[PDB]
Design a protein around this ligand. Sequence first.
Ligand SMILES: Nc1ccc([C@@H](O)[C@@H](CO)NC(=O)C(Cl)Cl)cc1
Ligand SMILES: Nc1ccc([C@@H](O)[C@@H](CO)NC(=O)C(Cl)Cl)cc1
Ligand SMILES: Nc1ccc([C@@H](O)[C@@H](CO)NC(=O)C(Cl)Cl)cc1
Ligand SMILES: Nc1ccc([C@@H](O)[C@@H](CO)NC(=O)C(Cl)Cl)cc1
Lengths: 178, 178, 178, 178
Amino acid sequence: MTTRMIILNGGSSAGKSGIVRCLQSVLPEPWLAFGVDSLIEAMPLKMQSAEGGIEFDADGGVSIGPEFRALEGAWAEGVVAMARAGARIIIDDVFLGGAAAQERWRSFVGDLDVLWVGVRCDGAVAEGRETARGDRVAGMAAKQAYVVHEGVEYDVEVDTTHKESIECAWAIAAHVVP
Amino acid sequence: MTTRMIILNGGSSAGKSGIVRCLQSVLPEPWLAFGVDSLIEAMPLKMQSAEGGIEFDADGGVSIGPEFRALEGAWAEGVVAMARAGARIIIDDVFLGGAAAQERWRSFVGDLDVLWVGVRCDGAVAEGRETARGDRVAGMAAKQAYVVHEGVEYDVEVDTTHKESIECAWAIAAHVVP
Amino acid sequence: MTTRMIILNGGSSAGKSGIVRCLQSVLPEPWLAFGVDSLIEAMPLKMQSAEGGIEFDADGGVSIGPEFRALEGAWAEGVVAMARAGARIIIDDVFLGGAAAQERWRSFVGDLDVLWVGVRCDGAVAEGRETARGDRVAGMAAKQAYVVHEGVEYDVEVDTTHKESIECAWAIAAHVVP
Amino acid sequence: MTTRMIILNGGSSAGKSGIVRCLQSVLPEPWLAFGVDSLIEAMPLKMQSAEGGIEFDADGGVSIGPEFRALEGAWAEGVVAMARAGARIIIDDVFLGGAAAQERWRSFVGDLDVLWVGVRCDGAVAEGRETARGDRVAGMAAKQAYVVHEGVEYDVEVDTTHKESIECAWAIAAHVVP
Ligand SMILES: Nc1ccc([C@@H](O)[C@@H](CO)NC(=O)C(Cl)Cl)cc1
Ligand SMILES: Nc1ccc([C@@H](O)[C@@H](CO)NC(=O)C(Cl)Cl)cc1
Ligand SMILES: Nc1ccc([C@@H](O)[C@@H](CO)NC(=O)C(Cl)Cl)cc1
Ligand SMILES: Nc1ccc([C@@H](O)[C@@H](CO)NC(=O)C(Cl)Cl)cc1
């Protein structure tokens, strides 16, 4: 019943990264972090616009091709395999496909003990943060603030609109079975 | 016989990262990159000095505790699992333990089709690059330039002392069975 | 009476950078940003521990030698000269010496039209953010949260404890005479 | 006759940044570095595509509007003022307008003791490095490799095609009058 993998889902600028860094600092056992950003980084730069692999519209839009989806699948199985091997894994993703994305993750996780965390934040508030962070593709924060959660089932839900990262980290840590 | 995982070993500032970015650009199929640096990043910051996890001496020295070694093991199995799942994986590491480190990797890779690449660079030349890159822990380049290769068996060997990254990438790509 | 230079002072993690990026986005005329961080970057790496130039104690402490102070002076005169030349300049610093630091700045600014902004944030809250940002030298946020303001006179004061960056940017922009 | 400001000009990926970091490490007196990149950073993000301020064509092309040119002028006068104030200033720029750009700089420098350095690199070789560095706007290295030097007069010329950064730093330091 001991928790093997923590999986956070949230729109862009919702505050995921900062919670993950806080969780790593809060939790006593060492946890490895692997978000969707670290995946994008492990992919070839060409994979980044050359269709088949992710493409950002000037209006903060994101579209995923099959080339990308195939790589993402292999990666998913790798992190799950890390958990299964005994490592503690935190993963922050952006369920663009709502429940569909969660189903996709469930198929990989199998029967592993997972904590499904939901990170919410006000669309307008998240967009302001997008601006303060210096993000390039402006428009995402607002576009993803609500849709990414549709039909997604969580075990915990934090809202970073009025709560700090270190605080949402505490609410989440309390649901982690050692 | 098709190559599943490429594994580069080399001292610090030997030029590994740049070859990896070149390989990703050169090779036709998308390859995921996961070096030891990306691992360090996935670990909690505390894990970075609090004994048990990696510690950098002021003289460019590096020591690895058991806490770290355990996490590294789980990670190793995860990337191998990614290959096994069908993803193409490039991995740049620093075999501080020479052959011992390679044996450790062999135990995880199993019977997977791997390309063992060796990236060499002149100790003094590598140290100059360490300085030009703005690295903080000065001293590593020179300390690791030769020892990391002792007793290590490669399928290919490039030397970045007089050859460019894009060029070493070409010599390496030519040994990749599609 | 048109504002030539905006000068923010605040402890570490008080939120200065994000306000500066927001101001740049909010204000209609292009403003150049030059904090104390960009200065540290323009200095030689050796200047960073080799006494005479800034040194960070393991307890989040900071000490400035004369080598550093001399360079900082020349830099100060350069940014003022940029304003005088017609550029709009935002500057975020950390008045470690309270009023002393402000006097030091006044001597350089001369009779230039300046907006003295004060960015406050709860010491404990700022320290939590320090943790979420992944800062290395932990301890500064708390150590600087209050002292840096002692005896310092502001034209505006924002508190990022409960107000967002984009919001503090709005309160500040409203005091900028075009 | 003591050198007050060092000014390097070179195409993208020609190796300028690394020489600058080497010079800072080599030269005994602390030198402040301020390239054109640090300027771009001090400007508002909007200033980065919204015409009037710099815009990168998908083919590695760069165009500068008047909004940008005005800010650049004020900045130029600021760094010169820093030198005049007694600071030692290194500046790496990209003379897109060949001699025109140098004339523009001469008008700001005045009678200050300046070292005009020229950093050359093979267009094809520079483009390979552009790829290994992970630069986004591919195409610049090749487009700027030669034109940026047309009609420009140097006091020193280094070629990074076959010489290392630390080495070009040594050839340049030897022309610096203390
Ligand atoms: N499906 C998807 C994958 C990656 C991304 C990223 O570009 C980016 C957008 O804000 N995500 C993040 O910063 C997360 Cl850490 Cl919130 C967004 C959406
Ligand atoms: N065992 C070991 C693990 C990680 C590291 C890194 O700190 C660092 C030292 O240069 N390595 C790199 O930059 C590699 Cl990409 Cl060449 C060095 C050694
Ligand atoms: N005097 C002083 C100069 C620079 C610094 C920086 O190290 C650092 C500490 O948080 N400052 C910042 O991040 C500011 Cl932008 Cl708030 C702190 C204090
Ligand atoms: N005029 C001009 C100004 C800035 C730039 C930069 O985008 C960039 C292009 O490689 N320059 C650098 O990296 C320099 Cl350090 Cl070689 C290129 C050209």
